[PDB]
Ligand binder design. Structure first.
Ligand SMILES: [Mg+2]
Ligand SMILES: [Mg+2]
Ligand SMILES: [Mg+2]
Ligand SMILES: [Mg+2]
Ligand SMILES: [Mg+2]
Lengths: 109, 110
């Protein structure tokens, strides 16, 4: 992952941080996703353990517990694509996408 | 205005006079030579607009178009990308890709 982004296909593991300025999103170990100083949380505290935050190809942030069980969903969706949840410097977590444009320094032709 | 973040360029934000995005071993730079250069990846990249303008500046709009205009607002290069109206962000990802994403289909509060 990226210190302030999460790409669809990537995971914000147990105790994981995404952070930008004074705002600290944590996939805490009480299975609650909390964005600190963001007045907001998944409110899934104690609802499981060894939890993970993921990003689906239709723009959903799904919190899976230790094994495989979903615990929380954004429940906002779009077309199949690459997406991005990012911690906005004004203090929101905002899902973005799908990709409209891509620059690839990793191609010979 | 909107607080810069190192590797993000949200819609509305503007780079120039080699303002630049950074991510580990990469930069994407809206230079002075009016050229948009990505130093990064294996081979890097550029909008290739060396001196095709004067006083240039890169700017992503609220419909996913990433554009270089000059001092008198002439398009010097575009991404020629467009989708719904709203907030988009360009990321300089750790893999060295520079990708645009949007629009905002979910935020944590308004
Ligand atoms: Mg993300
Ligand atoms: Mg998009
Ligand atoms: Mg940066
Ligand atoms: Mg990028
Ligand atoms: Mg982007």
């Amino acid at each position: 992952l990226g210190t302030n982004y999460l790409l669809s296909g990537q995971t914000l593991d147990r105790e994981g941080h995404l952070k930008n300025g004074d705002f600290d999103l944590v996939m805490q170990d009480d299975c609650n996703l909390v964005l600190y100083n963001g007045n907001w949380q998944s409110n899934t505290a104690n609802k499981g353990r060894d939890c993970k935050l993921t990003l689906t190809d239709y723009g959903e942030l799904v919190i899976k517990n230790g094994d495989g069980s979903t615990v929380w969903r954004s429940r906002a969706q779009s077309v199949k694509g690459n997406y991005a949840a990012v911690v906005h410097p004004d203090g929101r977590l905002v899902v973005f996408g799908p990709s409209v444009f891509k620059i690839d320094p990793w191609v010979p032709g | 205005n909107i607080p810069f973040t190192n590797n993000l360029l949200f819609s509305g934000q503007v780079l120039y006079g080699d303002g630049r995005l950074t991510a580990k071993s990469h930069q994407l730079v809206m230079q002075g030579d009016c050229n948009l250069v990505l130093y990064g990846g294996k081979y890097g990249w550029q909008s290739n607009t060396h001196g095709n303008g004067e006083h240039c500046f890169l700017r992503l709009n609220h419909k996913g178009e990433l554009i270089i205009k000059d001092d008198d607002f002439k398009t010097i290069w575009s991404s020629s990308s467009s989708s719904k109206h709203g907030d988009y962000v360009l990321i300089l990802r750790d893999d060295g890709f520079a990708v645009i994403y949007g629009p905002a289909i979910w935020e944590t509060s308004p």
